[PDB]
Amino acid sequence: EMVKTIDTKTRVVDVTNEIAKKKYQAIRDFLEGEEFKEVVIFGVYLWGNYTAQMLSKYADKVYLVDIHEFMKGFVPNNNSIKFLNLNEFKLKFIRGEVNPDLIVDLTGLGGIEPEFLAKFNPKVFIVEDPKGVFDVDIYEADNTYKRTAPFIEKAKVGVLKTYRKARVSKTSGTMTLTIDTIVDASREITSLDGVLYAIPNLRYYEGILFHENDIHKFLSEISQPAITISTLNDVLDEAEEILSNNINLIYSFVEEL
Amino acid sequence: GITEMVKTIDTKTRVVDVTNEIAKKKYQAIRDFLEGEEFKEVVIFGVYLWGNYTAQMLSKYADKVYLVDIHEFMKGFVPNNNSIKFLNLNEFKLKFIRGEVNPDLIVDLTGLGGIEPEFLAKFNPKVFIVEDPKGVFDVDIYEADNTYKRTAPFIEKAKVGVLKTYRKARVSKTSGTMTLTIDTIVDASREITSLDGVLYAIPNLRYYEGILFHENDIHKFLSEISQPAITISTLNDVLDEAEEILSNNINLIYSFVEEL
Ligand SMILES: Cc1cc(OP(=O)(O)OC[C@H]2O[C@@H](n3cnc4c(=O)[nH]c(N)nc43)[C@H](O)[C@@H]2O)c(C)c(=O)[nH]1
Ligand SMILES: Nc1ncnc2c1ncn2[C@@H]1O[C@H](CSCC[C@H](N)C(=O)O)[C@@H](O)[C@H]1O
Numbered sequence A: 001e002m003v004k005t006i007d008t009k010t011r012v013v014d015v016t017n018e019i020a021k022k023k024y025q026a027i028r029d030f031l032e033g034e035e036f037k038e039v040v041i042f043g044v045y046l047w048g049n050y051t052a053q054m055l056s057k058y059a060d061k062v063y064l065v066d067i068h069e070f071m072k073g074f075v076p077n078n079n080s081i082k083f084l085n086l087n088e089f090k091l092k093f094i095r096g097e098v099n100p101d102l103i104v105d106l107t108g109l110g111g112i113e114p115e116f117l118a119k120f121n122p123k124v125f126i127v128e129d130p131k132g133v134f135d136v137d138i139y140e141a142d143n144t145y146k147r148t149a150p151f152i153e154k155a156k157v158g159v160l161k162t163y164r165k166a167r168v169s170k171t172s173g174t175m176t177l178t179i180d181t182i183v184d185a186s187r188e189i190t191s192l193d194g195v196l197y198a199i200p201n202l203r204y205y206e207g208i209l210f211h212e213n214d215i216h217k218f219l220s221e222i223s224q225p226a227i228t229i230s231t232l233n234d235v236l237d238e239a240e241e242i243l244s245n246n247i248n249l250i251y252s253f254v255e256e257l
Numbered sequence B: 001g002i003t004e005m006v007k008t009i010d011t012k013t014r015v016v017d018v019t020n021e022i023a024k025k026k027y028q029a030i031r032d033f034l035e036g037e038e039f040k041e042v043v044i045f046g047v048y049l050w051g052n053y054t055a056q057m058l059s060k061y062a063d064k065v066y067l068v069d070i071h072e073f074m075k076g077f078v079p080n081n082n083s084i085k086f087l088n089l090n091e092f093k094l095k096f097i098r099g100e101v102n103p104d105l106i107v108d109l110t111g112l113g114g115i116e117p118e119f120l121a122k123f124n125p126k127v128f129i130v131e132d133p134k135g136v137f138d139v140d141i142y143e144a145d146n147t148y149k150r151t152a153p154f155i156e157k158a159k160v161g162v163l164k165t166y167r168k169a170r171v172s173k174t175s176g177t178m179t180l181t182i183d184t185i186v187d188a189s190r191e192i193t194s195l196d197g198v199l200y201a202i203p204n205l206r207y208y209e210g211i212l213f214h215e216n217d218i219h220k221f222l223s224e225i226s227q228p229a230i231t232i233s234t235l236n237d238v239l240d241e242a243e244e245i246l247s248n249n250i251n252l253i254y255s256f257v258e259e260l
C-alpha cells in the first residue's frame, strides 16, 4: 500500500545521551582541565554516572552519591568510581574519610540541603540549576543560590544552566529536555510533505526507577525509537535532521559566581 | 516518586475517549445530513476507526446494515450484541453477483487507497456519503485522494455528501480519526506543560495502527488505546485544568457534510 511506517534510528536514549554530553561539555569548559584529588558528585539520575566517568580522568578518586541505593545499578563495576548511598557517604564524612576538593550537585528540586553542603570546604563547587522558563512555582521551589552561599567566599563556584534557544522547557532536567525535544520534533515532522502523522514515543520512565526500582526495565524502555511516522514518503533522513536540529538548540553553560 | 514535592498525575481522559469524541462528531455530521431518512439496506465500507460506531448508530434507521472491510480480521471490532452484519469485500462482491445486496445508503469511510470508483458505480443508492480523508493541503496527500472521482457516478441520481473533518487554527495532515487523536493529545500535552508548577507532560501514544494492521490483535489494540491520554509531572494538582485543556483541544475539531 501507499502508506509507510518509519521509525527514527535515533532512540530516546540517544537524545538523553546527547543532552548529557552537552551538559558535561559545559562543565569541562568551566574546569579547563583542573586536576583534583577527590571528586564528589551528588545525584546519579540522569547524567551523574556519565559525569563521574568523564571527571575520573581529572581526579585521583571519584565518589558518586545518591540518596537511593538502587541507583548503584547505573554505575559500572569499574573502580575509577565509587558509588555510595547518602547515608554511607555521611558516615565516611563523619569519620573524616572523605574531603572532596570538587563537589558537583546534580540533585535539583528537593535535592541535597545547603546546610549539609556547608560542612564541606571544596576548591570548586558546581550546582545544576533545575530551572527552565520563568515559572512562579518552580522558581519558588528552587534553592540553587542557597546551595552556592556557603562557598562563594572561598571557592570557585559555578552554576550549570541548560535551556532551549527560543523554545519553552519548564526545567533543565535531562528528561524534561528529552521529552520536549522529541515532542517538538514530532510536530515538525508532521509538517513534512506526505506525512500523515508522527508519534513521539515517550513513556513515564521515571516511574520505572523511582517506583519500581527496575534499572534493566528502565534501560529497555528508553532504547525505543524516538518517533514513529505514518507517511506517503520516505522522510527518515528529514526526520533525523529535524531531531538533530532540535538537539542542537539545547544550550548548556556554567555561570561563574 | 522522584522527590516529595513532585507529583505524577494521569488524566482521567483516555486515548480511546478522545477517539470516541471524534467519532461522535463525525457521526453527528452524518446524522444532520441524513435528516432522519430511513433506509432498507445500508452498506458502510471501512471499519477502522469509526465504522462500527457508524453502523451501530445507523441501525436505528435501517432494516439491514452491512459493514464491509477488505480485511477479514476487522470483524473483532464488531461486538457480539448487535444486528450489524460484517462481510469481507470478497464476500460482499459475491453477494452482489448473486443479486443479494442493493443498498439505498452507501457510506464510504475507506479514505486513501480505498474502495474503487468503478466498483461503487455498480450501485444505485438513494444517498451516498464519502469521507474526505484530506486535511490541510499537502501535495502528495491531495494527489493520492480521489474522493470526487468516487462521487461522480452518483451526482446525477443520488443525494451525495462529502464529510470533511478538520481542526480550527491548527494543522492536521488528514481527517483520519487516529491522526486527529494524536494531534489533539500532543497539542494538549504542550499546553498542559505550560501551566504553573508543571515540570513536563507526556502524551501517552503508541503506534496502535500496527497492532491492528500487522499484528491483527484487536484485543491488544483496545487494551493499549485505553491508556490515560497524558501523564504529568508537577508541583501542583493540575488535573482539572488538564482535563479542561484536553476538552478545549477536542472542541477545536469540526465535522460537516458538504452536499454536492
Ligand atoms: C469522469 C466523470 C466526471 C464527473 O464530474 P466531476 O468533475 O468528477 O465532479 C463534478 C462535481 O464534483 C464537484 N467537485 C469536483 N472537483 C471538486 C474539488 O476539487 N473540490 C470540491 N469541493 N468539489 C469538487 C463539483 O461540485 C462538480 O460539479 C462526473 C459527474 C461523472 O459522472 N464522470
Ligand atoms: N539529598 C540527596 N543526595 C543525593 N542524591 C539525591 C538527593 N536527593 C535526590 N537525590 C538523587 O538526585 C537525583 C535527582 S533528579 C536530578 C536530575 C538531573 N539534575 C538531570 O538533569 O538529569 C536522583 O538520582 C535522586 O535520587
Ligand SMILES: Nc1ncnc2c1ncn2[C@@H]1O[C@H](CSCC[C@H](N)C(=O)O)[C@@H](O)[C@H]1O
Pocket: B045, B046, B047, B048, B049, B050, B068, B069, B070, B071, B074, B089, B109, B110, B111, B113, B114, B115, B116, B131, B133, B175, B176, B177, B178
Ligand atoms: N477497498 C476497500 N473496501 C473495504 N474496506 C477497505 C478497502 N480499502 C481499505 N479498507 C478498510 O478501510 C479502512 C481504511 S482506514 C479509514 C480511516 C477512517 N476514514 C477514519 O477516519 O477513521 C480500514 O478499515 C481498511 O481495512
